[PDB]
Design a protein around this nucleic acid. Sequence first.
RNA 1: AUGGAGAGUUUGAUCCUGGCUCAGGAUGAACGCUGGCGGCGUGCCUAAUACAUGCAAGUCGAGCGAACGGACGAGAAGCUUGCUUCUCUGAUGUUAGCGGCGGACGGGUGAGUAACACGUGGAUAACCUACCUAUAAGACUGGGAUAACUUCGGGAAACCGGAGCUAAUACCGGAUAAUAUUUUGAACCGCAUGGUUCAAAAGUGAAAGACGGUCUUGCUGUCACUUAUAGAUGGAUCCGCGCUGCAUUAGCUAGUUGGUAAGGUAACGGCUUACCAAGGCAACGAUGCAUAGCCGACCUGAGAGGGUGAUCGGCCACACUGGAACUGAGACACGGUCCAGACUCCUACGGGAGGCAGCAGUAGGGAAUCUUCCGCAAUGGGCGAAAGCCUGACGGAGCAACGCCGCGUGAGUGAUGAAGGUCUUCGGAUCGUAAAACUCUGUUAUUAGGGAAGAACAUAUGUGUAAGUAACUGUGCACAUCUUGACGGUACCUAAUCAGAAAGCCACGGCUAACUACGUGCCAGCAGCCGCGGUAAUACGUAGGUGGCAAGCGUUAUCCGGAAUUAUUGGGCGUAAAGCGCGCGUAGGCGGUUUUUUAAGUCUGAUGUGAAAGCCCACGGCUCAACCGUGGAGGGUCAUUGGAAACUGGA
Lengths: 67, 199, 90, 80
Amino acid sequence: LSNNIEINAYIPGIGHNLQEHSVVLVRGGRVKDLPGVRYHIVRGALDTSGVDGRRQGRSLYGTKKPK
Amino acid sequence: ARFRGSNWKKSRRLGISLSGTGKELEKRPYAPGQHGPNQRKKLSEYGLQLREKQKLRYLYGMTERQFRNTFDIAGKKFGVHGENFMILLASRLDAVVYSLGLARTRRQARQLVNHGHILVDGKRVDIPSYSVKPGQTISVREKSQKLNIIVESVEINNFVPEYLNFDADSLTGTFVRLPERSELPAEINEQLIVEYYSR
Amino acid sequence: AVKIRLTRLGSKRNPFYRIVVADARSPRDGRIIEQIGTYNPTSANAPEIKVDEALALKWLNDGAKPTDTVHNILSKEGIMKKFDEQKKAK
Amino acid sequence: RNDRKVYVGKVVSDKMDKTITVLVETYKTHKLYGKRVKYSKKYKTHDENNSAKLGDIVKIQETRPLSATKRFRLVEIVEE
RNA sequence: AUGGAGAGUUUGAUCCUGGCUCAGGAUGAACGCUGGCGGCGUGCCUAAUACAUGCAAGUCGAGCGAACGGACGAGAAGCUUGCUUCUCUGAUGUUAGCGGCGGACGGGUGAGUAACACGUGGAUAACCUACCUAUAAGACUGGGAUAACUUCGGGAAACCGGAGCUAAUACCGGAUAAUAUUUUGAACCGCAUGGUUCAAAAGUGAAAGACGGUCUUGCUGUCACUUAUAGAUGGAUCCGCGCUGCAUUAGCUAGUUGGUAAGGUAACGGCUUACCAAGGCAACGAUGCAUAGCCGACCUGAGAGGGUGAUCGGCCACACUGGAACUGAGACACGGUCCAGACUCCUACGGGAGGCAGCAGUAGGGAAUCUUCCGCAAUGGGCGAAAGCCUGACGGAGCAACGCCGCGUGAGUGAUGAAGGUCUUCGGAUCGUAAAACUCUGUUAUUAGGGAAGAACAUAUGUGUAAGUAACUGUGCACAUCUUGACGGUACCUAAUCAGAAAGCCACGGCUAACUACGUGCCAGCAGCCGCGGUAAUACGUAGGUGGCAAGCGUUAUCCGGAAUUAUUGGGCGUAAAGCGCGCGUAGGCGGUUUUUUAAGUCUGAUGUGAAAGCCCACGGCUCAACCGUGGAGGGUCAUUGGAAACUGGA
Ligand SMILES: [Mg+2]
Ligand SMILES: [Mg+2]
Ligand SMILES: [Mg+2]
Ligand SMILES: [Mg+2]
Ligand SMILES: [Mg+2]
Ligand SMILES: [Mg+2]
Ligand SMILES: [Mg+2]
Ligand SMILES: [Mg+2]
Ligand SMILES: [Mg+2]
Ligand SMILES: [Mg+2]
């Protein structure tokens, strides 16, 4: 992170474009299944792309209106 | 208006005729949509409270924010909260115009006020949310005295509540006094609405 | 020095003023010594003026000096004549 | 004439010259619980003649700063 | 009486204990999706990081010398009587400089500060105060200079040096003048020190002119000047009380604590310095460490409480970092100076220049926060006699759903329940009065006309009046007249045309309002918790339908609530977490009965104060509301003073 703390962030949605050296926005929220992951990646912010073909709850996954 | 959706579907869901005639409930007195015809499970206590609140809200065609603000100001007054809320809802220029009978529908009455056809104390008031107080005279704009909608609505001799006093010849009403719970719609259980806003 | 002046209130394009006794170095809408009245320029096509003669005269005696609009107000309310009359009579 | 504050306390130190330390006891109610709790403050007082002695009840009045820490003077000796 | 909801989850099942989680409200929010408008607000929280450029502090010719400009209009005819020069007068004007005042305000920021910083209540018989007001007494008599200017010289520059000349409301001497200073008489008074008032001497301390009026070998108006004493204003110091975490921080202090004397300060004072003594502080938390501007308020809560300190107002602190003084009534001074440091820039290398935590704006940092705008028309401030000038204060405009409030995206009729999508028991059911059709409307939109308030004025111009004068001009006051608007042709209003351009977002197993189909198959995924998904998933993804909201809807972060889970209100300690292994005891807390008394606690009044804004209540103004205004009400553990005396305390 910008504060220089290293963290594990969950990538939500089906499919992702992220690679090493990608720049991402991280929000709060832990994944209960995953022990070390206490944060989520924000979809459709900075480098992270929106989930492709998401047509319900698009705002959560960074997808624009399909029309 | 603001909500412009199916008034029938909203009536059928809430089990009350929003038009006040029962035309919506005559053929299909059950909730809209796929599962409407099938049996409806019993409502929870929250479900009943919400239903009653929605009934009153959609009856007066108000948005939730404004409905809740009106509920608050009503609560700040003296007496029974639920009754005060209902009389305050009835005192809206919207409701007053409709009840005088210048329009045949509440939405129509709202459009009449919103398009600037109505006069209050001789002056143009265009806010449907305007709170009419006792002693004020509601009139039609001099240009709009011969509107087909208004004339036809007035010709249909709609019953005018006792708290109002309408003269159809002059198309002039008077808000004589505050309504009474007796005069207000009987299908609403305001206590449930108070409870709803309690939690 | 000490000044009898108008402090601005109200909203944008709706001025209301309180007639106050203030030190000149004080900010317009800041520290005051006393409020003596109010003035409303935009009210009903007639300036609505409330002023306390007892307070205004006490301050005028002690060397407080009106701004031009305030002098007009104290003239309209008759305080400026009273100040002159006493002062000449003294 | 405006009146300066007067306190009554017991002399707890007479070691300094022309000075006595007087402990004034007051009660501070607890903000939440409401019980009054005993509280003491030592007041440095001017005693020109070194009249007072440890253990004597004394009356002190506020003055201008007479020293770095002394703000009170001895009005009288109430008990000895 | 105006105010108080619970739910899930430990088990095979149970009751209890207990934590965890959720439903609410709030924000200077950010992010995702989406997006019509208006009103009123709000908008660098992070780098007190660095800052290109313009602007943010001037003004006064009625203080002064000087210079420019030279009207009006002076002379010769070039024979050009329209053009000409210096041999003049030279008006309205203007400016570099001197001098006065301002620049200590207004504006910014919260770094530092755990402190009498701040809040609240007191004190100063320990203070200071330009301008303003009032009163009284004065403003006399002389002098020597110096900017500008001229000339010379030295510098790359910044900018210096010499000579000559010249004014002032600039500077200086003397006179006269104190309630100031010393000394000696008293008189009265308070709260130690002391206050006050009246007499007699001694030393010592001022000042100024300018512009006008007139009856002009002298009076006078306005403004300015000096001294003394008050008022007003602002500032300073002291003190009671309140105001933060940590003891896995227990000792701390030697100008330190006090005294004496002197110096110093507006002033008291270890404020400082010598001298003398050994004090002072601390478990009622000193000292240290960490963190922090404080408050009015703000958010939440039924309340008690808990959390916080944006915008606005008050107080404090700071101005590249550190130190220091100068000028001044006031500064140890944001856009002043000097020095040191870091940084940036210029240089002829000798030496110079600079400080956005003013307004915009830029770079950087950041999840994230605006235009290098218009006007001094209003309000306020500086200067001026005034017009006026200056004013990034401020009034406006711009940008951003960032918030709050208001109004839209249509309304009536409409079975003929059309088509189509979806589901299906293949009957149908649902989307759905929804649509279409028909009729109507114009908020809004568009187009075209009209068109506010905000403006008071000041000044000038008349008239009157009051004071003063010999009178006048002026001066104060009163009443008339002209003229002044950035916004802006904006708001608003009117008419014409058109449903046309104006709905999205989340959710639907339970909590929790709203279910089906299909695809998928412990995968892909979901998830606040209980969990869900391994082939007939109301939990994934999509579709239809529904629900909740709406120009928003969701997510994340953070605070209060629910949480009686730090329990005063309002919990406990046999077995659930929790009685020290047990004595002796110190401080502290608490304590039997009666009488008398006191009145600290307690109770009951009065007085002052607790700014304004806000909250609350009422009323009034904006088409309504938000918002604005006004009046109440409330808010102290407050101070002072008068009663009551049961209880607690004291005797
Ligand atoms: Mg800090
Ligand atoms: Mg509670
Ligand atoms: Mg400065
Ligand atoms: Mg600056
Ligand atoms: Mg809204
Ligand atoms: Mg989902
Ligand atoms: Mg609690
Ligand atoms: Mg146990
Ligand atoms: Mg035991
Ligand atoms: Mg107040």
